[PDB]
């Protein structure tokens, strides 16, 4: 019932039920915890209005330790890839009933970023995370192989199509397995920037030996993609559009949740997450991904747990 | 089981009567007799399996008892033995009778409630019908 | 005379020339998409223009050589050995999320489907490119990921949830069909993102009837749709595994592609008041008009499901040609699913779980506190207190079977596009307040009207409805097919104002046709067709029947009988209200004109005579006393008698009469007295 107000201060949420379905707790203890922990800056007690005026809208607290706080629901206004000759640590191969379906990005020692679409099941016993591998079957090498179970899954905001999971145990970080940083909250990549993607998918090959495919890409404004799609897409602020020039090559089945990592100033940094849509590598057609920066701060808020 | 409100057509939809019949005073939920049906005041149940059931509401003769003298009795019956209604004792139409309530007080010469002025075994009243001169009032005897 | 004036009742049969197209085989499925209309028929696919129904192109999935080892889409035409079968199209959908393309599904070909790609410059060119949807299930060859369509009967629904093309398919299953190839009663399929096959997202994403009940407990789906983040199914099935009696059921679950999570089934029934109707035949999702929304308690924007229910032959699904139509607000039934029913009305699902199984010995329900959250031990819940709805036409169609329904809105009213099994199409304004006569009641074709119809409503003033009768597809504009068929002024004024025409002194005519200027739709002159009789005595009070129409003052629907009066000269005939109708009157009162006065106008009729009865001569004169002779009278509701015994009327006329005199034991003469409703002047004597 809220519109034109992205900040909770304009909308006093007259509701005390979070997204998950768990009732809100007393706002006094969580207010004390915020004043002790959050330095953002006397709101209504035990109601889902957020004091922080977060960009995602109103949010509330939950007494359960696994999820300290969550938002209350209300209205608010690779094909033609190149094989890699060196191992990659940012890649996280997800394993569903002991076989790979998708990939993700390593952010912390116990945290990876993936796509909501790559989760047919919500069960945690069947998922398995592999870090530090050059071959999708694991045949290439096993010294850098790192196998872990799943502890917790936390989804992004509504309609974000993004998700994080924290591992059953921590993971060791070395040269073989690497983490990635975060872009700034208002971090905007300049147009015509060149950066690539990593993929484990169909790759448009009659037979592939099983090595990860790196594929270059170029950034362009949303207007160029709108013209190329000829009005078939209504782009929102949260999405970024990057497409190859004069060649049809893009992420497809099996690469979803993969990293769109690009180099701005000194080192490579993640900018987007691979998302299904619009078809599989149409010639002279750009690709659409979800930008982490708009949700990066939110990940910060959830990385505190 | 609580009656289904006559404004809401769930779980039963025969509730257009608030607009169908004017002046019949079917309230928000209280059960009436919009058609004057012989069974009595019946209402829809919020219970799904049974649609409508007649409310058990007592008759009027149940509370009005009778003594042999009759003149001592002063109750609420204003209906004769044949179901006719006693005319206003204050009125002079359609019967130009003799008893005047202010001339003869102390005997319950109220609006239409049956009285025994002439020492009959039962109370009687002049009939609202101009043709019927007067009629007796049917009352069961008292106890204890 | 009710019979004689029957011309007032509207002429039920006409020939209407509308754009109509014929197919060489009966049409099963049809869709309108981007100024092209695609029709699927036996072995045929046609594409037509809207305004012309011109066959611009056709694709030929004709007869196919069915061979036991031939795979669905591989070419086994060289096999000369194993029958030239023919397929029928029951699944014809269009999708544009991936590309602007069509999807069709055959019957005999293992229920496997194909895809047609539309060129951007010329989208109607469907024969240009053809794909098959068949991915060899290497990992799990035991089950079919692409054997998706059944043959006896199936329903397919397309959706785009989470940027994912989902097909919700319900299948009618025979016991002998599973052993050759497994199927699923209700299931969800995903298209492979390369558009070359299907996969099962979960083993829980499907439900199939338990192996013992494949032969028994048959289920036939009549409809299905999507609304409010839920997928609703409408089918017909037995009350109980051993009931041998049928009723309508609906199925609810939300649109999570992982699997059917909150699968809950619900019996439905619509009643007359108290006769119930079991089987649903056709259904349509729409929005209610302003006049109807209040009377059904529904919001103007809230969705409504309209369904036709016909009483089936006892302990069987075949209707007894006794049907009606009923409405269901989606919010009421949704709340009913969530709150209205208590606990013990809920049981486990029989045909899947099995009557004796562990889950429904004891299991709590998070039905109120939780909305179709994808849990692991989800409970497929069976209700027992069937939702009862009331009739909307109070059984005005109680003897005719209805099989096709469409509904649109116009201004504040809403109109239902009724269809019969004898191929008569009606247009009716639906209203619980009062019975509405179908403003269009013509017959289209001999064949029953197909349930699947489509309505398009451009700019709220120009639109059409395509309906299928056998091998004919016909376009019907909703803006008013006509009103020339109306010939009663009361009937003309009962026509809804959406079509602009009115009465001008002879027939219901369009405004600009009759030039007299009498064209009126609010008031008109009442009509009298004849009167019986016109010969009455001066003092004779004779009962006169008045034949005509529009005999009373008008209200919106209830035709007032009290604003009627009769004037005979200066006095008034004794009007009888109990025999006063819109159809005929019965009154009980020298040529004078009889005048009928109404709230609208008065009619003068110039031929009624107070004829003075005259009797002149009696024959014979003298004879024996046998009392069995023919006595003839002559002169100018009559009776005649002698000696207290009526002479039987051997001949009657205005100028001639003849009795067979009763026998009397006397040989003298008496005056024979005429009693023409009154003892009139008697004639002379005749010796006995």
From Swiss-Prot, chain B:
Query: What is the protein's name according to its record?
Result: Hepatocyte growth factor alpha chain
All disulfide bonds of the chain are: 3-43, 31-55, 65-142, 86-125, 114-137
In this protein, which residues make up the domain named Kringle?
1-60, 65-142
From Swiss-Prot, chain C:
Residues annotated as domain Sema: 2-478
Subcellular location(s) per record:
Membrane
Q: What is the effect of changing residue 122 to Y?
A: Found in a case of cancer of unknown primary origin; uncertain significance; somatic mutation
* UniProt domain IPT/TIG: residue ranges: 526-611, 613-688
Cite the ranges annotated as topological domain Extracellular: 1-688
- The disulfide bridges present are 70-76, 73-132, 105-113, 144-147, 270-326, 348-360, 483-501, 489-524, 492-508, 504-514, 573-587, 647-659
In which domain of life is the source organism classified?
A: Eukaryota
Tissue expression per record: Expressed in normal hepatocytes as well as in epithelial cells lining the stomach, the small and the large intestine. Found also in basal keratinocytes of esophagus and skin. High levels are found in liver, gastrointestinal tract, thyroid and kidney. Also present in the brain. Expressed in metaphyseal bone (at protein level).
Glycosylated residues: list them: 20, 81, 121, 174, 362, 368, 545, 570, 591, 632
For this protein, what post-translational modification is recorded in UniProt? Answer: Dephosphorylated by PTPN1 and PTPN2. Ubiquitinated. Ubiquitination by CBL regulates MET endocytosis, resulting in decreasing plasma membrane receptor abundance, and in endosomal degradation and/or recycling of internalized receptors.
In which family does this protein belong, per the annotation?
Answer: Belongs to the protein kinase superfamily. Tyr protein kinase family.
Its assembly, as annotated, is: Heterodimer made of an alpha chain (50 kDa) and a beta chain (145 kDa) which are disulfide linked. Binds PLXNB1. Interacts when phosphorylated with downstream effectors including STAT3, PIK3R1, SRC, PCLG1, GRB2 and GAB1. Interacts with SPSB1, SPSB2 and SPSB4. Interacts with INPP5D/SHIP1. Interacts with RANBP9 and RANBP10, as well as SPSB1, SPSB2, SPSB3 and SPSB4. SPSB1 binding occurs in the presence and in the absence of HGF, however HGF treatment has a positive effect on this interaction.
* Role: Receptor tyrosine kinase that transduces signals from the extracellular matrix into the cytoplasm by binding to hepatocyte growth factor/HGF ligand. Regulates many physiological processes including proliferation, scattering, morphogenesis and survival. Ligand binding at the cell surface induces autophosphorylation of MET on its intracellular domain that provides docking sites for downstream signaling molecules. Following activation by ligand, interacts with the PI3-kinase subunit PIK3R1, PLCG1, SRC, GRB2, STAT3 or the adapter GAB1.
Domain comment in the entry: The kinase domain is involved in SPSB1 binding. The beta-propeller Sema domain mediates binding to HGF.
* Annotated disorder: Activation of MET after rearrangement with the TPR gene produces an oncogenic protein.
Give the protein's recorded name. Answer: Hepatocyte growth factor receptor
Which residues of the entire protein appear here: the answer is 26 to 738 of 1390
């Amino acid at each position: 019932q809220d519109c034109y107000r992205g900040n909770g201060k304009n909308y006093m949420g007259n509701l005390s039920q979070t997204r998950s379905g768990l009732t809100c707790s007393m706002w006094d203890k969580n207010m004390e915890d915020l004043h002790r922990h959050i330095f953002w800056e006397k709101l209504n007690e035990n109601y889902c209005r957020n004091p922080d005026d977060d960009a995602h809208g109103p949010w509330c607290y939950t007494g359960n330790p696994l999820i300290p706080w969550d938002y209350c629901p209300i209205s608010r206004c690779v094909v033609n890839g190149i094989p890699t000759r060196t191992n990659i640590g940012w890649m996280v191969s997800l394993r569903y009933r002991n076989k790979h379906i998708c990939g993700g990005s390593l952010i912390k020692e116990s945290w990876v970023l993936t796509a909501r679409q790559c989760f047919p099941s919500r069960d945690l016993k069947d998922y398995e995370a592999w870090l530090g591998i050059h071959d999708v079957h694991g045949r290439g090498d096993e010294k850098c192989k790192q196998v872990l179970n799943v502890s917790q899954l936390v989804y992004g905001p509504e309609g974000s199509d993004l998700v994080l999971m924290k591992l059953a145990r921590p993971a060791v970080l070395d040269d073989f397995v690497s983490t990635i940083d975060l872009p700034n909250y208002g971090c905007t990549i300049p147009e015509k920037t060149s950066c690539s993607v990593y993929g484990w998918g169909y790759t448009g090959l009659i037979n592939y030996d099983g090595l990860l495919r790196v594929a270059h890409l170029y950034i362009m404004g949303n207007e160029k993609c709108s013209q190329h799609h000829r009005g078939k897409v209504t782009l929102n602020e949260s999405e970024i559009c990057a497409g190859a020039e004069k060649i049809g090559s893009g992420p497809c089945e099996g690469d979803y949740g993969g990293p769109l990592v690009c180099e701005q100033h000194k080192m490579r940094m993640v900018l987007g997450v691979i998302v299904p849509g619009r078809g599989c590598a149409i010639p002279n057609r750009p690709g659409i991904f979800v930008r982490v920066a708009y949700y990066a701060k939110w990940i910060h808020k959830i990385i505190l747990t | 089981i609580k009656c289904q409100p006559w404004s809401s057509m769930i779980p039963h939809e025969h509730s257009f009567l608030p607009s169908s019949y004017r002046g019949k005073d079917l309230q928000e939920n209280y059960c009436r007799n919009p058609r004057g049906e012989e069974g009595g005041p019946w209402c829809f149940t919020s219970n799904p399996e049974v649609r409508y059931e007649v409310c058990d509401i007592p008759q009027c003769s149940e509370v009005e008892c009778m003594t042999c003298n009759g003149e001592s009795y002063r109750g609420l019956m204003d209906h004769t033995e044949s179901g006719k209604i006693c005319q206003r004792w204050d009125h002079q139409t359609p019967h130009r009778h003799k008893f005047l309530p202010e001339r003869y007080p102390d005997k319950g010469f109220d609006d239409n409630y049956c009285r025994n002025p002439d020492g009959q075994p039962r109370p009687w009243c002049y009939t609202l019908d101009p043709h019927t001169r007067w009629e007796y009032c049917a009352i069961k005897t008292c106890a204890d | 005379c009710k019979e004689a004036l029957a011309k007032s009742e509207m002429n039920v049969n006409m020939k209407y020339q509308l754009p109509n197209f014929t197919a060489e085989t009966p049409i099963q499925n049809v869709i309108l998409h981007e100024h092209h209309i695609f029709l699927g028929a036996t072995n045929y696919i046609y594409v037509l223009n809207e305004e012309d129904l011109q066959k611009v192109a056709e694709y030929k999935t004709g007869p196919v050589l069915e061979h036991p080892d031939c795979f669905p889409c591989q070419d086994c035409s060289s096999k000369a050995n194993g029958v030239w079968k023919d397929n029928i199209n029951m699944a014809l959908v269009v999708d544009t999320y991936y590309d602007d393309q069509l999807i069709s599904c055959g019957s005999v070909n293992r229920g496997t489907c194909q895809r047609h790609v539309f060129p951007h410059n010329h989208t109607a060119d469907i024969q240009s490119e053809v794909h098959c949807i068949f991915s060899p299930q290497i990992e799990e060859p035991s089950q079919c990921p692409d054997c998706v369509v059944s043959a006896l009967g199936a329903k397919v629904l397309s959706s785009v949830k989470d940027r994912f093309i989902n097909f919700f398919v319900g299948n009618t299953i025979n016991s002998s069909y599973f052993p050759d190839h497994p199927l699923h009663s209700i299931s969800v399929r995903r298209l492979k993102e390369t558009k070359d096959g299907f996969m099962f997202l979960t083993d829980q994403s499907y439900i199939d009837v338990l192996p013992e009940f494949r032969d028994s407990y048959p289920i036939k789906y009549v409809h299905a749709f999507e609304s409010n983040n839920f997928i609703y199914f409408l089918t017909v099935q037995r009350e109980t595994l051993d009931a041998q009696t049928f009723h309508t059921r609906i199925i609810r679950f939300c649109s999570i592609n992982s699997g059917l999570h909150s699968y809950m089934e619900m019996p439905l029934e619509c009643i007359l008041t108290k006769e119930v109707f079991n089987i649903l035949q056709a259904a349509y999702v729409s929005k209610p008009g302003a006049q109807l929304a209040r009377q059904i308690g529904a919001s103007l924007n809230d969705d409504i499901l309209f369904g036709v229910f016909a009483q089936s032959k006892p302990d069987s699904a075949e209707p007894m040609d006794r049907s009606a139509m009923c409405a269901f607000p989606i919010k009421y039934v949704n709340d009913f699913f969530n709150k209205i029913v208590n606990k013990n009305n809920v049981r486990c699902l029989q045909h899947f779980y099995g009557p004796n199984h562990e889950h429904c010995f004891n299991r709590t329900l998070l039905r109120n506190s939780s909305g179709c959250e994808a849990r692991r031990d989800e409970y497929r819940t069976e209700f027992t207190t069937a939702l009862q709805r009331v009739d909307l036409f109070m059984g005005q169609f109680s003897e005719v079977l209805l099989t096709s329904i469409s509904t649109f809105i116009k201004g504040d009213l809403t109109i239902a596009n009724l269809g019969t099994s004898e191929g008569r199409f009606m247009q009716v304004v639906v209203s619980r307040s009062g019975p509405s006569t179908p403003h269009v009641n013509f017959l289209l074709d001999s064949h029953p009207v197909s349930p699947e119809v489509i309505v398009e409503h451009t700019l709220n003033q120009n639109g059409y409805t395509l309906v299928i009768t056998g091998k004919k597809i016909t376009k019907i504009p909703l803006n008013g097919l006509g009103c020339r068929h109306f010939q009663s002024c009361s009937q003309c004024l009962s026509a809804p104002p959406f079509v602009q025409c009115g009465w001008c002194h002879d027939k219901c005519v369009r405004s600009e046709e009759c030039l007299s200027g009498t064209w009126t739709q609010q008031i008109c002159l009442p009509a009298i067709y004849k009167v019986f009789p016109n010969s009455a005595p001066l003092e004779g009070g004779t009962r006169l029947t008045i034949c005509g129409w529009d005999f009373g003052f008008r209200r919106n629907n209830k035709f007032d009988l009290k604003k009627t009066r009769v004037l005979l000269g200066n006095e008034s005939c004794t009007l009888t209200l109990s025999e006063s109708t819109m159809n005929t009157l019965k009154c009980t009162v020298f040529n004078m004109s009889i005048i009928i006065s109404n709230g609208h106008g008065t009619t003068q009729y110039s031929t009624f005579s107070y004829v003075d009865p005259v009797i002149t001569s009696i024959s014979p004169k003298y004879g024996p006393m046998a009392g069995g002779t023919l006595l003839t009278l002559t002169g100018n509701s009559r009776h005649i008698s002698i000696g207290g015994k009526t002479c039987t009327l051997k001949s009657v006329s205005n100028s001639i009469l003849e009795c067979y005199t009763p026998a009397q034991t006397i040989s003298t003469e008496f005056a024979v007295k005429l009693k023409i409703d009154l003892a009139n002047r008697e004639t002379s004597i005749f010796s006995y």
